[PDB]
Amino acid sequence: MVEFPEGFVWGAATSGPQTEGNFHKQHQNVFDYWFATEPEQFDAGVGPDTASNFYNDYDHDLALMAQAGVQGLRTSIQWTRLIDDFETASLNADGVAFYNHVIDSMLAHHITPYINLHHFDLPVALYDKYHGWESKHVVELFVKFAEQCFKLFGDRVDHWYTFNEPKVVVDGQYLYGWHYPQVINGPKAVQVAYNMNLASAKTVARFHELSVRPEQQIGIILNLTPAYAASDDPADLAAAEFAELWSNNLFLDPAVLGHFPEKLVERLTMDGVLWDATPTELAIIAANPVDSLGVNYYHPFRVQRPDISPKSLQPWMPDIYFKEYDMPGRMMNVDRGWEIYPQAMTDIARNIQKNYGNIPWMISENGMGVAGEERFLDKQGVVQDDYRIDFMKEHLTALAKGIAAGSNCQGYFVWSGIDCWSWNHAYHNRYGLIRNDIHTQTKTLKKSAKWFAELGERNGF
Amino acid sequence: MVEFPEGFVWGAATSGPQTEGNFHKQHQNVFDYWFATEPEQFDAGVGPDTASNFYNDYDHDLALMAQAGVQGLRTSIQWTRLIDDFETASLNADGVAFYNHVIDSMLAHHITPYINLHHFDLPVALYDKYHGWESKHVVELFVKFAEQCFKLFGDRVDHWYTFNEPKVVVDGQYLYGWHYPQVINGPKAVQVAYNMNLASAKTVARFHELSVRPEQQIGIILNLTPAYAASDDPADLAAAEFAELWSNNLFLDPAVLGHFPEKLVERLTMDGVLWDATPTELAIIAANPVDSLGVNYYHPFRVQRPDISPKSLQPWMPDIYFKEYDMPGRMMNVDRGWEIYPQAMTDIARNIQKNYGNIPWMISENGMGVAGEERFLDKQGVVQDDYRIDFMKEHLTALAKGIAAGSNCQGYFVWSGIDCWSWNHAYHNRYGLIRNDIHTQTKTLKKSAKWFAELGERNGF
């Protein structure tokens, strides 16, 4: 009834910091330090130290993900586990052996690895020593870390990602206090956005120098949700224009087109907050675009005119040009406070098709979080998450409208395979196809897990 | 200047729970239990245990209402006072003796008795054992109770009411937390609204099985305030449409027309929350419409679209289809949060006239509550409540226009005669023509009282 291209990849996504636990990890990342420092900032004081126990139970967890129809698993390697000396990217042999075991175990369970290099997990010592992503020196050390990943694992991994959503690192570490170190500094944020874009192009350059097979590709993962204008009132449309240049073009254009959006550069220059670039850096960005795109979508995004004029005497923030808008009559997931609007998928598919060369791309994240799922256990122990299935039905149906009209979409990765630790929210919301009782680390497929499996075999629904 | 038809009843209204006190009352109703158990939920810690001392002082209390021009008095008999065993409706001899004394004292004072059977006072033991109005067994037990009242007092009581506003019991007990048990559950509310309509029809049948004089008639007291849309945008009149069906037609159509409003049942059906009804129950409802209508009006009712779509993921409530609206420029009773809009009574009179066969009806409640009436004591300790006299003239002016279009309105009852106990608000707001000083239980007539007595002696103002 609703079918998909031949060879479509049906996958799941997570990250290392949200699954492994900190068992025997040499270094603290910023979240590790934050929980060790301020456990009160974490739901029920549940931090990352055990997470979903993937460090100990990876082999059986991959078997369950295989039962749930996961053909490709996207996760990440932790900079703070793999590397001994950040300055030289010397190797921690127990961390090297651990990633070798999960990649081999993925292969034995017929799961194609999708390895991402960074998911919000900057080592805190590099923030102490250099202020982290503000340092073009840290940019080099990350490339050296990526180098080591490609040489150790490149023989078995075809699909790579530089970053999971650099924008969330910008927003979290430097604008709104979501990530330790919780800096509130707009101008610094602009430079960190530039530096991470430059880190990614440099990683793409290194990756292709060290390539061995043609099948090996490397991409980036971004949120590309449209910035819908509240109305056709010129202050609203102009707000949506900056919101999109800033929340999407900031990374899309360097990543795919190899340059920064011209109107955005103009705006930040006028406000005197523009990043420091060099022509050689800009040339490396121009010469090394990504090979593919991962798209994360959960909920739509609407903006209206700011309340006060952007010329007011206030610290510079991107938000001086736009304000979030709530649309009368929106379809809501009320407990989570999120609008449900599946066609945003279809708009994304059309944008990549028209404006970004129809570059090959996948939905790298899509999913629905629900609290207190114990309420929907049958006494056979299986969560009856019919809501998750309907959510996936609506969004896959809109994604199908995009593929049919010619969008080069190649895969759909659910967030997430197994319930995992959602930063300061920890396990308050569950996204998995598979349920984790985090007291015992005992995992059990939900109803949606069997549905996802049949979806992959039928390649539709 | 503003005159009324011949025979128009000028009366006053209260209830047993709000006047009697619990002196030697055998059983606890839901409010008694709530107060005995959470006194903090009631203004100044004042509960119903003494109320306005009507149990002890009914005789002199009645002599004063008669001085205030109360020609007929509506109040209620408490299920929890008259009945020994609820399962059989056996009699508590002291309760019977009390209500005989009250009724006989009314006629000795030439007040016509208007006796209502139920005013928010479900026995708490019937809730514990059966979940109260959710049980069709409890509906039968109420008919047994109603039958005893008819047999005991029908020899000198011509005018009866099955219920005072069952929608307030639905709303308070099962939707918004106003009444103990404070259940929040849309589906149950739907079933309780249906069950209470069924109890009233069953009571009407029993009443006419026993009625011997043609003067004997039984009615129901409803609030029929129109749902005024905020604007004529289609979303707001959709909201006003449902709010009308739900707040008025849900009770008025079964009571007067013999059937539930079809487009309401269609929407309750589509949403999966329809009550459980048998053919026999529906035929009883069709076959026993009430004889007359009691209308309570205090303030208008304005409605706009809901903030989110009724299809959002939320528990079913009637409120998913409409949100209240505050009209800019409203005339307000500021100390109370209530709009003043007397035209509404003209609209109700016309609705009843055109669309309900012009059934004999009365205003069973209308009044204004104000706090701290100590501030308007004159030199002889009489409240000078000109605000109350004005309020009456404006609403009587509107009623008289409805009658002049021919509407079959036959009387006007003010709330209230003596200041009585207003549930969780207790004695914060006073509505009476007669002030009650509650520490000593001394009642003195307000200035509005002498004005009410002249209005009846003249049929106008």
Please work out, in degrees rounded to the nearest 5, the angle formed at the alpha carbon of residue A423 by the alpha carbons of A417 and A428: 70
Residues paired with residue A91 on neighbouring β-strands, in sequence order: A83
Question: Coil, helix or strand for A378?
Answer: coil
Nearest to A80 by CA among A99, A103, A56: A99
Cα dihedral A258/A260/A261/A265 (nearest 10): -160
Lookup: tokens for A290 = 């990504």
Active site residue A365: yes
Lookup: tokens for B264 = 């309401």
Are A330 and B314 an interchain contact pair (Cβ–Cβ within 8 Å)? no
Whole-angstrom CA distances from A201 to A194, A281, B17, B45 are: 11, 9, 78, 71
Eight-class DSSP state of A249: I
Nearest to A338 by CA among A304, A302, A390, A372: A302
Nearest to A345 by CA among A296, A414, A410: A296
Interatomic CA distance for residues A318 and A174, integer angstroms: 12
Eight-class DSSP state of A344: H
Residue of A nearest to B315 (CA): A334
Whole-angstrom CA distances from A360 to A13, A72, A353 are: 18, 16, 9
Q: Give the nearest partner residue to B312 out of A326, A332, A387, using CB atoms.
A: A332
Stretch 291-350 of chain B: residues touching chain A, C-beta under 8 Å:
305, 307-309, 311-314
Interatomic CA distance for residues A437 and A52, integer angstroms: 9
Burial of A345: CB neighbours in 10 Å, binned 0-12, 13-18, 19+: buried
Are B308 and A387 an interchain contact pair (Cβ–Cβ within 8 Å)? no
The CA R_g of chain A, rounded to the nearest whole Å, is 21
Tallying the residues shown for chain A, one arrives at: 461
Interatomic CA distance for residues A441 and A86, integer angstroms: 32
**In the block, residue with structure tokens 């245990």:** B49
Interatomic CA distance for residues B180 and B173, integer angstroms: 6
Nearest to B315 by CA among B153, B109, B174, B459: B174
CB atoms within 10 A of CB A215: 8
Q: Is A376 within 8 Å of chain B by CB?
A: no
Helices (H), A124-185: 124-130, 136-153, 166-174
Cβ atoms of A439 and A55 closer than 8 Å? no
Contacts from B388-391 at CB under 8 Å and sequence distance 24+?
B388/B433, B388/B446, B388/B448, B389/B447, B389/B448, B389/B451, B391/B340, B391/B367
Q: Give the nearest partner residue to B313 out of A326, A329, A334, using CB atoms.
A: A334
Cα dihedral B117/B122/B126/B132 (nearest 10): 100
- How many Å separate Cα B144 from the centre of its chain? 22
**Terminal alpha carbon distance of chain B:** 6
Are B312 and A331 an interchain contact pair (Cβ–Cβ within 8 Å)? yes
A chain contacts of residue B308, beta-carbon cutoff 8 Å: 329-332, 334
Question: Coil, helix or strand for A361?
Answer: strand
Interatomic CA distance for residues B366 and B411, integer angstroms: 12
Nearest to A292 by CA among A167, A149, A408, A153: A408
Burial of B310: CB neighbours in 10 Å, binned 0-12, 13-18, 19+: buried
Active site residue B165: yes
Method: X-ray
Are B308 and A332 an interchain contact pair (Cβ–Cβ within 8 Å)? yes
Q: Give the nearest partner residue to A329 out of B309, B313, B314, using CB atoms.
A: B309
User: Which amino acid type is present at position B218?
Assistant: I
Residues paired with residue B428 on neighbouring β-strands, in sequence order: none
Burial of B265: CB neighbours in 10 Å, binned 0-12, 13-18, 19+: middle
Interatomic CA distance for residues B62 and B70, integer angstroms: 9
Residues paired with residue B112 on neighbouring β-strands, in sequence order: B72
B405: left (phi over 0), alpha (psi -120 to 50) or beta: alpha
Residue B19 CB contacts under 8 Å (≥ 6 apart), including other chains = B51, B52, B54, B75, B418, B420, B421
The catalytic position among B165, B244, B281, B373 is B165
Lookup: tokens for B343 = 């035209």
What's this structure's resolution in Å? 2.3
Interatomic CA distance for residues B448 and B9, integer angstroms: 17
**Terminal alpha carbon distance of chain A:** 6
Q: Give the nearest partner residue to B235 out of A326, A329, A333, using CB atoms.
A: A329
A chain contacts of residue B309, beta-carbon cutoff 8 Å: 329-332
Tallying the residues shown for chain B, one arrives at: 461
C-alpha torsion sign, points A328, A334, A338, A341: negative
- Convert chain B into a string of H (helix), E (strand) and C (coil): CCECCCCCEEEEECCHHHHCCCCCCCCCEHHHHHHHHCHHHCHHHCCCCCCCCHHHHHHHHHHHHHHCCCCEEEEECCHHHHECCCCCCCECHHHHHHHHHHHHHHHHCCCEEEEECCCCCCEHHHHHHHCHHHCHHHHHHHHHHHHHHHHHHCCCCCEEEEEECHHHHHHHHHCCCCCCCCCCCHHHHHHHHHHHHHHHHHHHHHHHHHCCCCCCEEEEEECCCCEEECCCCHHHHHHHHHHHHHHHHHHHHHHHHCCCCHHHHHHHHHCCCCCCCCHHHHHHHHHCCCCEEEEECCCCEEEECCCECCCCECCCCHHHHCEECCCCCCCEEHHHCEECCCHHHHHHHHHHHHHCCCCCEEEEECCCCEECHHHHECCCCCECCHHHHHHHHHHHHHHHHHHHCCCCEEEEEECCCECCCCHHHCCCEECCCEEEECCCCEEEECHHHHHHHHHHHHCEC
Nearest to A366 by CA among A343, A392, A397, A332: A392
Are A334 and B235 an interchain contact pair (Cβ–Cβ within 8 Å)? no
**In the block, residue with structure tokens 């909920």:** A299
Q: Is B235 within 8 Å of chain A by CB?
A: yes
Cβ atoms of A311 and A224 closer than 8 Å? no
Instruction: Count CA atoms within 13 Å of residue A39 on its CB side.
Output: 7
Interatomic CA distance for residues B342 and B361, integer angstroms: 18
Interatomic CA distance for residues B328 and B317, integer angstroms: 27
Are B313 and A329 an interchain contact pair (Cβ–Cβ within 8 Å)? no
Between chain A and chain B, the number of residue pairs with CB atoms below 8 A apart is 30
Element (H, E) at A309: none
Residue B91 CB contacts under 8 Å (≥ 6 apart), including other chains = B82, B83, B84, B148, B152
Eight-class DSSP state of A366: -
A69: left (phi over 0), alpha (psi -120 to 50) or beta: left
Ordered by where they begin, the domains of chain A are: 1-461 (3.20.20.80)
Sheet holding A302-304, edge to edge: A228-229, A302-304, A323-324
